[PDB]
Amino acid sequence: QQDLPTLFYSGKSNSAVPIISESELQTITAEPWLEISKKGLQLEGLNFDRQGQLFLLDVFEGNIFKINPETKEIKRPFVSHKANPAAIKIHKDGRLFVCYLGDFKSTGGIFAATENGDNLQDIIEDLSTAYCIDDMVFDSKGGFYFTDFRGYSTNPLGGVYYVSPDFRTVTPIIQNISVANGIALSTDEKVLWVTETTANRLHRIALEDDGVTIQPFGATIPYYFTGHEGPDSCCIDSDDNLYVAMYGQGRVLVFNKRGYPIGQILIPGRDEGHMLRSTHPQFIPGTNQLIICSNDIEMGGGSMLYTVNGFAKGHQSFQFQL
């Protein structure tokens, strides 16, 4: 957390229910942090381990990178054996859970492995299930919610599902979503955030204490995004703010706990069409420094990790609890 552009609780960003348009949002431009390659890689799945080391991957080739935020050294522990891996969520026991899309129609799933790619275990099989899992989030009990990345605008085949801590039970939380993409839990785990990419909508779901039942009229749409392509991955901070990467828009939008926009982070070169594939936001553990990955594949230009300081320190998600 150095002297990078920072988001402050000023003006409408400090209001509980600010009435404001995207063009007037407190805005900052992210700075280059670490180039992953001169080559165009579909970077995704940012996630730090208990040691504060950064893990991520590229969807198309399945490479898995481990980065030292301190020295900025890049390592390539292993490669996904499953097609189109999209996210990495680290378990409290140190394992890496990898969500993958497969053929984009039904051969997706989730597998776990060690930091080095050993002990490959199937959490959710690809052929026995019809899921194409794009992301997930662990609750404090070891269970997790994942997004079913399927369908399109008027064909809502997607949805959100909950997997029990023993990975034996899978129960649907909310369905009829045109490609569920990003997902996150509020600090108290009573609210579930989900982004619907092909319909440009943000979902806010109030859950009962059992964590699987939606409160009466608890599933709402606090925000309608705009622009091609749509909302992608997201994460929260300790103040319960939501950071949403906008795929194809070269930006990240930030909302407060009530779902109102309060911040905007732009990726350099977006106006000229560069680095529009901003796919994931993630905080360096114990700090308010946000890391954002994007790539310039669409114009032949490499893969970069950008950074800025968010409103508050990152949240102590599962891999940081004990």
* Residue 9 annotated as lining a ligand binding site: no
- Distance, CA of 41 to chain centre: 17
Contacts of 77-80 with C-beta under 8 Å, sequence gap 24+, read 77/115, 77/116, 77/117, 78/113, 78/116, 78/117, 79/117
- As a 3-state breakdown, the chain gives helix, strand, coil percent values, each rounded to 5, of 5, 50, 45
* Residue 139 annotated as lining a ligand binding site: no
247 is written with which tokens?
């795929």
End-to-end CA, the chain: 25
CATH classification at residue 230: 2.120.10.30
* Residue 233 annotated as lining a ligand binding site: yes
Other C-beta atoms closer than 10 Å to the C-beta of 209 total: 9
* Residue 256 annotated as lining a ligand binding site: no
Give the method used.
Answer: X-ray
262 is written with which tokens?
């309060």
Q: What angle (nearest 5°) sits at the alpha carbon of residue 117, between those of residues 317 and 110?
A: 60
* Residue 232 annotated as lining a ligand binding site: yes
DSSP 6: B
296 is catalytic: no
* Residue in 265, 272, 273, 320 with CA at minimum distance from that of residue 289: 265
Domain count, the chain: 1
Other C-beta atoms closer than 10 Å to the C-beta of 114 total: 14
* Residue 176 annotated as lining a ligand binding site: no
Q: In angstroms, rounded to a whole number, what is the distance separating the alpha carbons of residues 287 and 264?
A: 19
The SS3 assignment for 78 reads: strand
Burial class (CB in 10 A: 0-12, 13-18, 19+), 193: buried
The SS3 assignment for 279 reads: coil
Strand partners, 86: none
- Say which of 232, 237, 240, 296 is annotated catalytic: 232
Other C-beta atoms closer than 10 Å to the C-beta of 299 total: 14
Other C-beta atoms closer than 10 Å to the C-beta of 118 total: 9
Q: In angstroms, rounded to a whole number, what is the distance separating the alpha carbons of residues 180 and 232?
A: 9
216 is written with which tokens?
């009466």
* Residue 169 annotated as lining a ligand binding site: no
CB of 92 closer than 8 Å to CB of 142? yes
Phi/psi at 272 (5° precision): -95, 5
Sorted by sequence, the CB contacts under 8 Å of residue 74 that are 6+ apart come out as 34, 36, 65, 66, 67
Sorted by sequence, the CB contacts under 8 Å of residue 92 that are 6+ apart come out as 138, 142, 318, 319, 321, 322
Q: In angstroms, rounded to a whole number, what is the distance separating the alpha carbons of residues 4 and 20?
A: 25
Sorted by sequence, the CB contacts under 8 Å of residue 105 that are 6+ apart come out as 132, 150
What domain range is 136 assigned to? 1-322
The SS3 assignment for 299 reads: helix
CB of 22 closer than 8 Å to CB of 226? yes
